[PDB]
Amino acid sequence: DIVKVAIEWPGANAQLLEIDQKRPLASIIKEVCDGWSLPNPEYYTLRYALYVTEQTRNDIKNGTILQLAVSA
Amino acid sequence: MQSIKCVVVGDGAVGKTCLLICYTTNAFPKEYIPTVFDNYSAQSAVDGRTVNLNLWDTAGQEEYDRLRTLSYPQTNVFVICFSIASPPSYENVRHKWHPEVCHHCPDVPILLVGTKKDLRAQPDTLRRLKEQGQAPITPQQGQALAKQIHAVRYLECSALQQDGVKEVFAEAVRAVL
Ligand SMILES: Nc1nc2c(ncn2[C@@H]2O[C@H](COP(=O)(O)OP(=O)(O)NP(=O)(O)O)[C@@H](O)[C@H]2O)c(=O)[nH]1
Ligand SMILES: [Mg+2]
């Protein structure tokens, strides 16, 4: 299963991605972080523009806009 | 060989997707499936030159309005569409679409496209629009809209009849080439 989303990062142009729901968020976040040349991806989390966790990952609907945010 | 980012926008159901499917495969899809966002890539030769035409399909439903605007940055040319059988989509161009595009991308050429040209003289379309006191959009009306928004060109086409779709994107690349 796949889901289309946009991920925003302040100052940069958003990335329009099709997320593979079989890949861990951690691999997706590392790829998304590379897209904006960001190290230390583990300290980032996707939240709605609420957090996207592995537990709720499948609640995401096509066309939803996510933010790449610095974790707590 | 240069690459051209071409973004197709317009009201929901005006035919932006069928437009891109016809140009890409000459098919015509069975049902209306709203677009979230989709990409097509094609090699096309215009005036003896070849370019990478990267076509970005866009959502016309208001639900995905802000999502649509995230695709805009660095667009080389916009194709703004309205249905010849939907005057409402005709009005939204000059009041909603042209303002929005100009704001996010000033000085980016705009090509104006009247889709579904085959419905201009169909009885069902004529009757329906007649009840509301309107008729299919006229070629003269399209030109007046193109002038008003400074479109580089005004074109009419029909994916269902495979009429003029090729020329639409040949002109998209020309506007920037
Ligand atoms: N008669 C006729 N119908 C057409 C033509 N092109 C598209 N349609 C119909 O118009 C309806 C909308 O088509 P579609 O390409 O999906 O429109 P869209 O602008 O991409 N919609 P969205 O903004 O939701 O993605 C569909 O039923 C399609 O069959 C055409 O040339 N002639
Ligand atoms: Mg569409």
Numbering used by the authors:
A (entry chain B): 6 to 54, 59 to 81
B (entry chain A): 1 to 177
Give excerpts from the publication:
To answer these questions, we determined a crystal structure of activated RHOG complexed with the RBD domain of ELMO2 (ELMO2RBD). The crystals diffracted to 2.4 Å resolution with a single molecule in the asymmetric unit. The RHOG structure consists of six β-strands and six α-helices and is similar in structure to other RHO family small GTPases. Characteristically, RHOG nucleotide binding is coordinated by two key regions: switch 1 and switch 2 loops which bind the terminal γ-phosphate of GTP and a divalent magnesium ion. ELMO2RBD demonstrates a classical ubiquitin-like fold consisting of four β-strands and two α-helices, but interacts with RHOG at a non-canonical binding interface. In contrast, the interface between RHOG and ELMO2RBD comprises both switch 1 and switch 2 regions of the GTPase. Major interactions include a hydrogen bond between ELMO2 Lys9 and the main chain at RHOG Phe37, as well as a salt bridge between Arg66 of RHOG and Glu13 of the RBD. GDP-bound RHOG does not interact with ELMO2RBD, while GTP analogue-bound RHOG interacts with an affinity of 7.8 μM. Indeed, ITC analysis of an ELMO2 Lys9 to Ala mutant shows the importance of this Lys side chain, as binding to RHOG is completely abrogated. A key RHOG side chain at the binding interface is Arg66 in the switch 2 region, and ITC analysis revealed a RHOG R66A mutant is unable to bind ELMO2RBD (right). Thus, the crystal structure of RHOG complexed with ELMO2 elucidates a novel GTPase-RBD binding interface dependent on several key residues that are highly conserved evolutionarily.
The evolutionary distinct and smaller family of DOCK proteins activates CDC42 and RAC to control cell migration, morphogenesis and phagocytosis, and have been implicated as important components of tumour cell movement and invasion. To understand the molecular architecture and mechanism of DOCK−ELMO GEFs, we have used cryo-electron microscopy to determine structures of DOCK2−ELMO1 alone and as a ternary complex with nucleotide-free RAC1, and combined this with a crystal structure of ELMO2RBD in complex with RHOG. The binary DOCK2−ELMO1 complex adopts a closed, auto-inhibited conformation, whereas in the DOCK2−ELMO1−RAC1 ternary complex, DOCK2−ELMO1 adopts an open, active conformation through a conformational change of the ELMO1 subunit. Our study suggests a model for how upstream regulators control DOCK2 activation through a conformational change of ELMO1, thereby relieving autoinhibition.
